Each structure stands twice: as structure tokens, then as C-alpha cells.
Amino acid sequence: PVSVLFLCTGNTARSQLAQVLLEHHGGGRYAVTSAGLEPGSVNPLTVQVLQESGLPTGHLQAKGVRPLIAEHFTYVITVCDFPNATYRLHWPFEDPAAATGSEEERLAVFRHVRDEIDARIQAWVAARV
Amino acid sequence: PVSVLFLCTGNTARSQLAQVLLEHHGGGRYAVTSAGLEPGSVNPLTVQVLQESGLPTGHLQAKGVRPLIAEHFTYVITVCDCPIFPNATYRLHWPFEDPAAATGSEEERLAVFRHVRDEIDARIQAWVAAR
């Protein structure tokens, strides 16, 4: 399969959303990984908005990129504003975890970013047949 | 000032809680540091529960312990279930449940973070008063 690595800063939100959404829309065609430069912890709101869409999240872990330093990926897609890859793509998305307000207000931002990443991934899988 | 290093695995939660709480309850009598063996990033839920208590968090950073090993610490206090500190006078162990291991909604996770905050807060107040 085609290997994709999604990279954000903490591996808590954007790169996790992208990982799960490519797993959904791409199916077995893609071996998908996500990582951050400084791993944190998966944000509960990330899980909430993915689960709202019926997407499973029990396999999600915030992980650092260092143990992957020697790996090669067909695509390394940076989702926040890696040495060895065929293609390096940049898809900047707003950090939903930087939004402030009540849980409901923040969830709205998480949903907006989820839907935007979902749209980009759908178009990207389709433009590859 | 009495020097204290709080040490957990990631420097994201338990050791940051303890640092801020000793800063608060100890005043300027303690030089407080925290570090982790494999540093991550400060957990936003750690920040939230400290801020709910009126405790400032803008100075918090996740950091590795390696630059600190040869430092003189009166106390090196591990709060997770560890380097050799030749210039540490005392080594204490205060195990606490890892709040970052909690799953569930934000409210459910914040409940564990608050429980652990409250326990560390109690231990630090008691320890400051000791002797």
C-alpha cells in the first residue's frame, strides 16, 4: 500500500483527525501513521468529534516522530503551520486545540476542522484513483 | 532555599502539578523544579485544573531530566511508579495515579486530574509543615 505519515506538533488533534479520516476514506490502499514533534495526549474533543462521525478511536495514541526518523513514507503530509519521503505535502489547518471557550464552543471548532480535513482527504483519495 | 526536583515519566502532569503546588504552598523558601525521563508536552488538563485553583501556569514547560542529573537537590521526589542524583540529599517517593491515563470525555478526565491535584496539594501542605 501507499504509506502516509501525518505530522502535527503534539499528535493530539489535527494529525489524529487526518489519520482516522484517511483510514476511513482510503481503506486498505494506504498504510497511515501520525506523529508529532513533541507528543502530548490525544485531546478528548478529538475523540468526541471522530466518534460523532462513527469513526473508531480506540487505537489512537499521541506519539513522537523520533522513532520513525529512519522510516520512509511515500507521502509526509504536514498538517501544522521529516527527512526521508517521496512527496512532502503541506495542508495547514487551524489548530482546534488552541480554540478557547466552553467545551461546546471548542467542540464546534473541532467539528469545523474535522469536516475540513475530511473534505481534503476525500478529494485527495479521489484524485489518485 | 531548599531545592526540590519533582520527577515523573513525561513531565506533563503529576510532576507539573507538584511543582506549581509547592511553589504556592512553599513560597520563596523552595527552589522547585520538575522534569521527566522522556519529556512530552504539558497536558492542557494539567493547566486547567491548576488554573481552577488560581495557580499560574504560563511558566510551565515539559523538560527532560538529563541536564539536571549532577545538580544539588535537597530532595528528589519521584511522583510516578530514575537517574542517580549524586548530589541529592534525600530521595522520596510519592506515587500518584497517572491522570493522563484516564480515558473518556473531557469532564471525566478532568475529574481524575482534579482528584490527583487535590491529593498532591494535600501531600505538599503536610510535607511543608513537617518537622
Side-chain angles (χ1 to χ4, degrees):
Chain A
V2 170
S3 50
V4 182
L5 167 63
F6 289 112
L7 289 179
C8 71
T9 53
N11 196 216
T12 80
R14 288 166 290 185
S15 60
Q16 298 287 357
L17 297 169
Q19 169 186 334
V20 171
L21 289 164
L22 184 53
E23 286 166 347
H24 171 80
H25 291 293
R29 309 176 58 210
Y30 301 93
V32 190
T33 310
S34 60
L37 181 59
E38 301 300 337
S41 180
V42 177
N43 193 307
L45 282 61
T46 305
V47 164
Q48 174 69 17
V49 300
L50 288 171
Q51 289 179 333
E52 282 174 358
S53 293
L55 302 170
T57 61
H59 63 301
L60 305 190
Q61 306 181 265
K63 75 201 73 67
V65 67
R66 189 207 319 106
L68 295 167
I69 188 62
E71 283 295 290
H72 179 81
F73 297 92
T74 303
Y75 294 94
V76 174
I77 305 172
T78 297
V79 295
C80 61
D81 190 8
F82 198 74
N84 288 272
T86 308
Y87 293 107
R88 294 175 182 87
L89 309 184
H90 181 36
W91 303 350
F93 302 103
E94 171 189 0
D95 185 0
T100 58
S102 72
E103 186 183 345
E104 288 295 327
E105 294 171 309
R106 287 180 280 116
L107 275 169
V109 181
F110 270 87
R111 288 181 193 112
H112 182 79
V113 174
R114 175 203 62 198
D115 290 349
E116 176 185 3
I117 295 175
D118 178 70
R120 289 294 301 279
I121 283 175
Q122 283 193 59
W124 187 74
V125 171
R128 290 176 32 83
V129 184
Chain B
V2 168
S3 51
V4 178
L5 173 67
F6 287 111
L7 211 61
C8 70
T9 47
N11 197 217
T12 77
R14 288 165 296 181
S15 55
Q16 302 275 3
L17 292 173
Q19 170 189 327
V20 175
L21 286 167
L22 182 55
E23 287 170 343
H24 172 67
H25 291 296
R29 301 182 175 273
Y30 295 88
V32 195
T33 299
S34 63
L37 282 73
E38 187 163 321
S41 174
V42 175
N43 197 304
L45 304 183
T46 305
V47 172
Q48 170 70 18
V49 303
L50 289 170
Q51 290 181 325
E52 286 174 0
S53 289
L55 304 170
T57 62
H59 61 114
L60 303 198
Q61 325 171 31
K63 70 201 81 57
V65 67
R66 171 65 184 85
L68 295 176
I69 293 177
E71 284 293 302
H72 289 251
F73 294 108
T74 312
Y75 296 90
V76 172
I77 303 178
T78 57
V79 294
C80 63
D81 191 8
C82 178
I84 315 99
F85 287 83
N87 296 119
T89 307
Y90 297 101
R91 282 275 295 100
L92 311 180
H93 178 38
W94 303 352
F96 299 105
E97 153 180 25
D98 181 10
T103 64
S105 69
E106 186 180 69
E107 179 190 23
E108 295 174 310
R109 301 189 188 195
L110 279 172
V112 180
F113 271 88
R114 290 183 192 108
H115 173 94
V116 176
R117 175 201 65 198
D118 286 355
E119 183 185 354
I120 293 172
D121 177 66
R123 289 295 304 277
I124 284 173
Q125 285 181 254
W127 185 74
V128 166
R131 314 208 308 263

